[model samples]
Target: YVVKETICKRCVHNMEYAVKVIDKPSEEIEILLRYGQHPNIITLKDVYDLVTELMRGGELLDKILRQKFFSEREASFVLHTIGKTVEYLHSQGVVHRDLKPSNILYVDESGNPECLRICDFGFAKQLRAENGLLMTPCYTEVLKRQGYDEGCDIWSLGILLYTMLAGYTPFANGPSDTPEEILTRIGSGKFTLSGGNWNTVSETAKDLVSKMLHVDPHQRLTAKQVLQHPWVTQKDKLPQSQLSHQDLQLVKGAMAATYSALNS
Candidate 1:
């Protein structure tokens, strides 16, 4: 985990720090980093000062949306990766309080399509029932000041997936205004698949979004459950997207270099 300390001035929370966990194991073993650099999964290799930016990669979901290049398959891939990463974190007893797309990263080698990795653990906290007050004020204000649990990440995931598919949030700046204002409006369960501009999208995608953004966290879909969702696996039955030969080589070279560095 990458730890960096910074003093917080705005909130009562002081001495804030960020934790980034890189899933790369030591090179003494022979297993491969098979998942690639998933944007929702935290990138760990560049944690040290030596190469933070390189390891941090970039955000793929945002890039896809911004570039207007997201097909249903691509969006599903992003959702799948995010679900897997969040499930892993929850199993480890960690709750990622803030999970916007800006916090996700993508590692794009010159010849390969970008791979996603999660980053920015500043808002991550160990889940505890007594830590209600420590919830970030900005998010709380947006969540209508509701009491929540570790499942808050699911809400954020819902918002993210919705934005990825529709190019805007169900709340905030469309049917609503700012993040805080949108939170207030979200009170009535105003945000729904039918309410947004998702009419053209698949029903499966809409179902996943609705499930993630459910008002009740306890009823929200867990990450493991999300992986098993029909939206993800049903699409997998279709042809799998392949990385270019050159891109595959780039990934191979990167893994080889990473392994070598870890050994030497």
Candidate 2:
């Protein structure tokens, strides 16, 4: 995938300072320092200024979306990976303010429906009561309107999940829509899941989306709480399984196809 450094230098400076303050060597810090270390999340290999070259992993959700390669089960798997990663980040008081499909990348090399690695820390902030003036009109409007706290990452996750199932954003009505308009729509809770192709998507998925997208910050699910949601918990119930030799070959073919599609 294409890795772009969308974050400004000022934001990177803030992150450096925040990292130094949290002196303890935490997993979250490590994840940020070297991208993601966890198997499910995308692993960061190296950093150059604001740019980061992530480890060669699987496809991006956006590319996957174009291919429509995932089943509801696979979608759930991807979401589970993202949820666990966000839980880890929140535990360390980090909030990933920008968590759209482009930021969530796959970790599987064989394309075996592996975990999603949550990247793009340029918009992420360390939650502190003393820290003010963190919100940007484009990024923070939705959180501000909802009175969200550090848990605002949950709202972002909700949007990501919704897009995965619906094949489009819940709030991005059109290319011309402004961030204020998008935030207004989200704050209004007027977005509908009722009369579309949602019938094929599982109710469990819908429920999780609702939980993440709640307008009230206090009422919204924390990253830790989201891991316990039914969509995540039910994955363990799957029967013993491993990628077969043939399955690996198929994955290789799909990966080639996916790469070609992305470049083309």
Candidate 3:
């Protein structure tokens, strides 16, 4: 392919970003162009996996697909890093409509789950702080009736934390007649950590999930508050035992579930 033969090898270090093969994907192009160069985010070359900074850590996609997750202590670090990134976006009046594991990427080849950043701006938008509602049905019921805002990111983060903790999506898994059930469960807040997989997760961990997944946008934890939560701030005090979040073996069916239904 032209990418591997040219871009991945000789041109990886070039300052120039990859030119679009076609101008057909106008929206994604606008999103990428608007982002430009920034901290805790991506440049055009970065999206192509041409940036040397990522090295081997790659997409959170690879980690989740491979069933490699992190401990609560580890998740704390990741959540903090991701929180800051989301906070920055919030401060800039930007909203990431899609905030899932696959959209997250590791910054370095260090292999720790903590060194991560958010990518994928396909659904990202710029909005002023005074805007009432985006009227976009990107994520969450709070957005359904009240329209959208930055809080959609928080809803996805809860699911991201859920999958990172329990090794599968809380609602997107198992038998279902309709995929809308995922959104329905999210809307009604129907879920439980009492499942065997969650026994090892700390109460504080579940507590954060509860607040982040709150049905009302006003009630949800902003990415800023998430960074301040005890689960992240008090990480040192938390047990480092091999919690369910860290154990890869318990991730049975989790990876397949992510792959099957995550595109939505």
Name the candidate that leads on lDDT. 3
Model 2 agreement with the true structure over 22-95: per-residue lDDT tens digits: 21123344446643555655444434322233334435543455443565666667767777776766665556
Worst 10-residue lDDT window, candidate 3:
134-143
Candidate 1: C-alpha lDDT:
0.52
Off by over 4 Å in 1: 1-57, 109-114, 127-147, 174-176, 195-197, 236-264
Clashing pairs in 2: 41-117, 42-117
Worst 10 residues of 2 by lDDT: 16-25
lDDT of 3 by residue, 1-264 (tens): 234433234233434323333322444545555554555575555434123233346666456436454467766777777788787777655677777666677766665755676666767765522355323223224323233556777777787787777766677554332446555665677678786867767899989998987767788887778988899899787766544443343343443353345455
Candidate achieving the largest TM-score: 3
lDDT of 1 at 42: 40
Report the lDDT tens digits of candidate 1 across residue range 1-264.
333443111111133223333443232111012222434454333223212233333355435644434466777777777778877766645566667666666655321233666655555554333544322332323243233645667777777777666655556543213334544656656575664345557778778888887876677887777788888888764333221111323322332332233224
Candidate 3 versus the native: TM-score? Answer: 0.71
Q: What is the TM-score of each candidate against the true structure?
A: 0.60, 0.63, 0.71
TM-score-better candidate, 1 vs 2: 2
lDDT of 3: 0.62
Better of 2 and 3 by lDDT: 3
Clashing pairs in 3: none
